[PDB]
């Protein structure tokens, strides 16, 4: 069975150097034609090919990141390392390493190259965030609503770092109609997310709404009762 | 570099259906093409290699065909775990480029989004920043466009948005968009509008409010 696992810094600051390591088992980088490549995936985006190295030490890099990348292998320790210099916020993504089969051989003679046309086994991937930001708790602001139609209200969890932050409503007693959106990494290097809940509208007078926010990394816990407005 | 274009970019389906995804290359890549399925939160998984070879362990439901500049991945009888994103990859030329991907989600009837706009709180304004949020709740399909307008001026570069994963029960999506301005600039305008365009809307719907107007 072949397995690979990426390791490295979950957080790195702009201009710094990022060193990622791929540790694998089940094959050797001394096996004929075998390769180990690196592919990244920014949040919500498509896969992007970065580089590949083979057992014979042949190496190839993405022409777009060529000057910032170096790939090397340590045959004895079953590892491949990718060094990316001068990182910037756009390099935030999940980095995967993957195995590439070499040509099939028969009594040592290559008889089929079809198997090399794919990356057949992938690591779980390692998420790397590039930001200069220091640990910072969120500022929580209300999202004030408005029988007939449905009413919406919520909380804005702004400017915190790093991920994650937990949000529930009414100590977890309110779940239906709730929508906690994935956070967005602001150009400032800080995260911000919204959590909302929709209701019939009548309950706006019977039921009270409070969003419970918890950012463990900064030891910040906040409960904010959100009511319509106008007193 | 070599360009790989997948089509459609998004596809709605139901369990048991047969679907086909296409990948076209800008230059011939012979048979050096692979297809992967990526479930949410997981790494890509090899389905087909060398354009049509079925990877060991992969269910017979998947099959690939084509060569040169035209390739297709077909799933006969879609299964629940097949609701994911699929990518094609070209390995004939360096760099070994990937397609933009095709998202396959659960099909349901078209549902226009309920739109709400939230002005910044006085609390936030005290810190010197103003965040205006727009919510598009429970809609389908996933594609929707949000345009912010301030005193009729189209906004660009000062907003960010997030979309929830398809709801397990609703099969709908929700989207949140935040327009961020300094207190100063915010206090310098009056009408803040969130214009929404969606297939479920006969015409664009616009939600707005006048700052300070109490």
């Amino acid at each position: 069975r072949i397995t690979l696992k990426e390791s490295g810094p979950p957080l790195v600051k702009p201009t710094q150097t990022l060193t990622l390591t791929c540790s694998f088992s089940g094959f050797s980088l001394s096996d004929f034609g075998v390769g180990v490549g690196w592919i990244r995936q920014p949040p919500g985006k498509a896969l992007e090919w970065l580089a590949i190295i083979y057992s014979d030490d042949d190496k190839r890099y993405s022409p777009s990141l060529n000057t910032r990348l170096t790939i090397t292998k340590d045959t004895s320790k079953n590892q491949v390392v990718l060094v990316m210099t001068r990182v910037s916020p756009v390099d935030t993504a999940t980095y995967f390493c993957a195995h590439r089969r070499g040509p099939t051989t028969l009594f040592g003679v290559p008889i089929a190259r079809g198997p090399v046309n794919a990356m057949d086994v992938w690591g779980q991937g390692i998420t790397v965030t590039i930001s200069s930001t220091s640990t910072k708790g969120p500022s929580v602001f209300p999202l004030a609503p408005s029988a007939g139609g449905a009413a919406a209200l919520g909380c804005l969890v702004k400017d915190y770092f790093p991920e994650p932050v937990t949000v529930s409503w009414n100590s977890g007693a309110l779940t239906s109609g709730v929508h906690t959106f994935p956070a967005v990494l602001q150009s400032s290097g800080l995260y911000s997310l919204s959590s909302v809940v929709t209701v019939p509208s009548s309950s706006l007078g019977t039921q009270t709404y409070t969003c419970n926010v918890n950012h463990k990394p900064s030891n910040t816990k906040v409960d904010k009762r959100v009511e319509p407005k106008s007193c | 570099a070599l360009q790989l274009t997948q089509s459609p970019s998004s596809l709605s389906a139901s369990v048991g259906d047969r679907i086909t995804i296409t990948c076209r290359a800008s230059q011939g890549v012979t048979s050096a093409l692979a297809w992967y399925r990526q479930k949410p939160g997981s790494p890509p998984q090899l389905l087909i290699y060398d354009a049509s070879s079925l990877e060991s362990g992969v269910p017979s439901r998947f099959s690939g065909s084509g060569s040169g500049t035209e390739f297709t991945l077909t799933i006969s009888t879609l299964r629940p775990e097949d609701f994911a994103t699929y990518y094609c990859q070209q390995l004939h030329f360096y760099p070994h480029t990937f397609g933009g991907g095709t998202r396959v989600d659960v099909r349901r009837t078209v549902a226009a989004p309920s739109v709400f706009i939230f002005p910044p709180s006085d609390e936030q304004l005290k810190s010197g920043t103003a965040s205006v949020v727009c919510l598009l709740n429970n809609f389908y399909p996933r594609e929707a466009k949000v345009q912010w307008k301030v005193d009729n001026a189209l906004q660009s570069g000062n907003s960010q948005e997030s979309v929830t994963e398809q709801d397990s029960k609703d099969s709908t999506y929700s989207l949140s968009s935040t327009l961020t301005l300094s207190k100063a600039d915010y206090e310098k305008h009056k009408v803040y509008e969130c214009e929404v365009t969606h297939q479920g809307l006969s015409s664009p719907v616009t939600k707005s409010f006048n700052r300070g107007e109490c």
């Binding site: 034609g33 190839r60 090399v116 | 050096a32």
Partner: peptide, 7 residues
């Protein structure tokens, strides 16, 4: 350029 195993 062409892949390692092309041609």
């Amino acid at each position: 350029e062409l892949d390692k195993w092309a041609s």
